[PDB]
Design a protein around this ligand. Structure first.
Ligand code: SAH
Length: 226
């Protein structure tokens, strides 16, 4: 149709199943609008937690003539999900891993119909993989990509009738991304190493035993996997 998405969200859109998209913390509803204009989905829910983004989403849905196709809802995380909703995809993008984790954990009662989850994490994706484990979700695909110099991970997960246990390396680096180790995987984790060694330039070893132990273990893990 008419909206242009960035590569990050375009990449998320390629994982959408037909039917309904619920986009939590929606980008002025541009992902739901894009999905309906490109016939990826036929119905949308756009969840917003504050009034500014809420009103911007309402205006954007009206401007694209999709008032009867996209429901814009105010509420925190999955609280926007209503018991009558039939949802094929939940998308949670442009957030840190720990916040996506919290939204899924705190809203876990909302996942009873076992939608596909497409999560796009800006940092600390480990926490989201740990939560997906706890909710009987299984990672079926992962992408790591770069846009304007920032490295982003997309995690695609579906329900499993048995809990899938991931190793400490699989939770930290991704069970699919480990199989690749593309230029963006290397760049992300070289940059994390640089940042961890830089923190060591600022912490006296006499005074920060606890944090340095954690930092040194993380460096050792990354140096083994690269
Ligand atoms: N607890 C929460 N529940 C729902 N939305 C939340 C939230 N905390 C933050 N948000 C919203 O999530 C958005 C994060 S910015 C990213 C926007 C879009 N998903 C994208 O990927 O480009 C903002 O709209 C912010 O208000």
């Amino acid at each position: 149709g008419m909206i242009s998405l960035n590569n990050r969200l375009t990449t998320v859109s390629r994982f959408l199943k037909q039917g309904t998209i619920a986009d939590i913390g929606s980008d002025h509803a541009y992902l739901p609008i894009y999905a309906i204009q490109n016939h990826l989905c036929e119905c949308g829910i756009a969840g917003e937690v504050i009034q500014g983004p809420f009103q911007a989403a309402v205006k954007n849905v009206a401007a694209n003539q999709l008032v009867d196709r996209i429901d814009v809802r105010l509420g925190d995380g999955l609280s926007v999900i209503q018991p009558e909703d039939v949802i094929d995809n939940i998308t949670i993008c442009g957030m840190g891993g720990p916040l996506i984790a919290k939204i899924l954990k705190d809203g876990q009662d909302k996942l009873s119909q076992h939608p596909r989850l497409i999560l796009q994490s800006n940092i600390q994706t480990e926490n989201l993989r740990q939560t997906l484990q706890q909710l009987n979700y299984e990672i079926i695909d992962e992408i790591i990509m770069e846009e304007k110099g920032h490295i982003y991970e997309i995690v695609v997960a579906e329900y499993s009738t048995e809990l899938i246990e991931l190793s400490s390396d699989e939770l930290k680096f991704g069970p699919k991304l480990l199989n690749n180790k593309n230029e963006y995987f290397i760049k992300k984790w070289q940059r994390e190493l640089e940042a961890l060694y830089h923190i060591k330039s600022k912490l006296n070893t006499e005074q920060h035993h606890q944090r340095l132990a954690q930092i040194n273990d993380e460096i050792a893990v990354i140096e083994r996997v690269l």
